Write a protein that binds this ligand. Structure first.
Ligand SMILES: *[C@@H]1O[C@H](CO)[C@@H](O[C@@H]2O[C@H](CO)[C@@H](O[C@@H]3O[C@H](CO)[C@@H](O)[C@H](O[C@H]4O[C@H](CO)[C@@H](O)[C@H](O)[C@@H]4O)[C@@H]3O)[C@H](O)[C@H]2NC(C)=O)[C@H](O)[C@H]1NC(C)=O
Ligand SMILES: CC(=O)N[C@H]1[C@H]([C@H](O)[C@H](O)CO)O[C@@](O[C@@H]2[C@@H](O)[C@H](O)O[C@H](CO)[C@@H]2O)(C(=O)O)C[C@@H]1O
Ligand SMILES: *[C@@H]1O[C@H](CO)[C@@H](O[C@@H]2O[C@H](CO)[C@@H](O)[C@H](O)[C@H]2NC(C)=O)[C@H](O)[C@H]1NC(C)=O
Ligand SMILES: *[C@@H]1O[C@H](CO)[C@@H](O)[C@H](O)[C@H]1NC(C)=O
Lengths: 316, 171
């Protein structure tokens, strides 16, 4: 008669996978679900990547002279480098993290100058701590006010928001090292800065005292921010120590963010970005970095997970 | 697997079969041969492609999130930020482990199942003209030249043609 055998294929070198019942069992084939490698490079498409180079987002915001190239820049992803440095008047930002976040998320440094009237003070103060060309200078977006003649009057100014968008105002307060410096610059023995809207108010008293010497000064500036909504009004009131805004930053909402990375930027296309570089997004999981931006595989702790793409391998 | 064909009553696979996943080996008067079954092979592949495409389906695109590395010690708020991310990562790591485990058990069972389907279909085709040897092979109880074998494989084999002949050899 005849014999007819039913059967299935096999291969000489199978792959091990995990199941409900077995932590290793051999199948004919599998595919990797965890992306574990990067090129080491951040692709410049399709997201608008802005390399901060020597500049933090905050220094570009304030207008540190070596960050002037960033004026009115926009981004989907601002990349901060570990080599970045400040090179202007020494400053702090109470709630630095929040200011950095909100600006990063806004995705723009578009600045609109406004005609503030500062009656009876000297404008455009600068310092050798913050050189602009050969001479002393200052943050481009801030206006250091000091006495005119022998007086610093009460400054009291308003700027209404008659636009249909939110305005972000960056301003500050100067902290002298000595009483001599305080009175020299602002006349009054103790200054005061009050910035308000209809909805909110911030009042800051300067503190006089030495801090450690940084880029020529034991003094400091502290940076604050105020958002003004359509139909609201900014009021600024001060009898000394005001580091005045020159205008506002336009705010947006959208997909913008910021990332700390030293990966070089390259000409290529990748939806997913990590600090290690761009990664492909064909796999559902990744083990490269929990910090990601874009259409990315989800971060998991496993460096490999095999999905079986074939039957059980039972060789000859 | 659940059906007990692959790594079960079929003792092993065929490294020689390179043109399909399941198929036939015969011995008759004219010699021996081997042919892949295309419909079983495709049923298995189609199902595996199906699940593959479901799994590699891009679901998430994220933009501004929370910070996940910190250069200074801060305490409470940072503790919470880290804990939120760690919690998330563990839940996703678990989802991934479970997913592959369930997927792979099911892939093994469904490939085992398709082998079994092909075996039961062939058995039914042969009616009373053959018997199950128990190792995935049918002893056919009549003369089955290459034309006859190809008839079983391509679905045309009329069992009534060979029934008298085969019933005789069986009993
Ligand atoms: C510093 O700058 C701010 C911002 O401009 C400035 O605020 C303004 O104060 C004046 C009063 O000093 C406000 O004027 C009021 O406007 C409302 C309508 O909007 C009127 O109804 C008010 O009239 C009554 O009060 C008058 C003043 O006493 C009376 O003479 C009158 O009879 C009414 O009873 C009044 O005119 C103005 O609205 C604000 N502006 C804003 C934008 O808020 C503030 O005065 C300055 N401070 C100092 C110390 O100089
Ligand atoms: C706006 C203004 O007054 N600018 C001054 C500046 C400030 O008075 C000062 O930064 C306040 O802390 O001072 C400048 O001169 C400095 C000296 O005041 C300081 O004692 O020593 C510095 C050198 O280490 C420096 O010479 C400045 O910062 O360059 C002069 C500037 O016009
Ligand atoms: C991606 O970058 C991260 C961040 O540096 C790498 O994480 C480091 O990995 C090494 C292990 O070789 C450790 O010594 C570091 O302590 C890790 N740092 C952190 C913050 O986790 C990660 O290994 C990189 N991955 C790839 C594939 O390049
Ligand atoms: C299995 O699938 C892989 C894709 O990872 C393919 O390259 C290979 O030829 C297929 N079969 C194997 C390895 O048996």
């Amino acid at each position: 008669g005849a014999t007819l055998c039913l059967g299935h294929h096999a291969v000489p070198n199978g792959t091990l996978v995990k199941t409900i019942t077995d932590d290793q069992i051999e199948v004919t084939n599998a595919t990797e679900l965890v992306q574990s490698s990067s090129t080491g490079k951040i692709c410049n498409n399709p997201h608008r990547i802005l390399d901060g180079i020597d500049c933090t987002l905050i220094d570009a915001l304030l207008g540190d002279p070596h960050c002037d190239v960033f004026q009115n820049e926009t981004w989907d992803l601002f990349v901060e480098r570990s080599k970045a440095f400040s090179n202007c008047y020494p400053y702090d930002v109470p709630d630095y993290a929040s200011l950095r976040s909100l600006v990063a998320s806004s995705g723009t440094l578009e600045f609109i100058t406004e005609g503030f009237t500062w009656t009876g003070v000297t404008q455009n103060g600068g310092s050798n701590a913050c050189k602009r060309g050969p001479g002393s200078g200052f943050f481009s977006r801030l206006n250091w006010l000091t006495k005119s003649g022998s007086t610093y009057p009460v400054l009291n100014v308003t700027m209404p928001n008659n636009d249909n968008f939110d305005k972000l105002y960056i301003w500050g307060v100067h902290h002298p090292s000595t009483n001599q410096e305080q009175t020299s610059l602002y006349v009054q023995a103790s200054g005061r800065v009050t910035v308000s809207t209809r909805r909110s108010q911030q009042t800051i008293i300067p503190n006089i005292g030495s801090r450690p010497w940084v880029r020529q000064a034991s003094s400091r500036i502290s940076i604050y921010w105020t958002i003004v909504k359509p139909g609201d009004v900014l009021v600024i009131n001060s009898n000394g120590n005001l580091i005045a805004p020159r205008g506002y930053f336009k705010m947006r909402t959208g997909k913008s963010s910021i990332m700390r990375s030293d990966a070089p930027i390259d000409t290529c296309i990748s939806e997913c970005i990590t600090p290690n570089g761009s990664i492909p997004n064909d796999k559902p999981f990744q083990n490269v970095n929990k910090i990601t931006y874009g259409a990315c595989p989800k971060y998991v702790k496993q460096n490999t997970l095999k999905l079986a793409t074939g039957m059980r391998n039972v060789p000859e | 697997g659940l059906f007990g064909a692959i790594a079960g009553f079929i003792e092993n696979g065929w490294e020689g079969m390179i043109d399909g996943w399941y198929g036939f080996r015969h011995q008759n008067s004219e010699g021996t041969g081997q042919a892949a079954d295309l419909k079983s092979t495709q049923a298995a592949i189609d199902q595996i492609n199906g699940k593959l495409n479901r799994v590699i389906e891009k679901t998430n695109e994220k933009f501004h999130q929370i910070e996940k590395e910190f250069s200074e010690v801060e305490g409470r708020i940072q503790d919470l930020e880290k804990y939120v991310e760690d919690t998330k990562i563990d839940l996703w790591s678990y989802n991934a482990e479970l997913l592959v485990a369930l997927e792979n058990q099911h892939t093994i069972d469904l490939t085992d199942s398709e082998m079994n389907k092909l075996f039961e279909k062939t058995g039914r085709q042969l009616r009373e003209n053959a018997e199950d040897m128990g190792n995935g092979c049918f002893k056919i109880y009549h003369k089955c030249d290459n034309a006859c074998i190809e008839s079983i494989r391509n679905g045309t084999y009329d069992h009534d043609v060979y029934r008298d002949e085969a019933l005789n050899n069986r009993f």
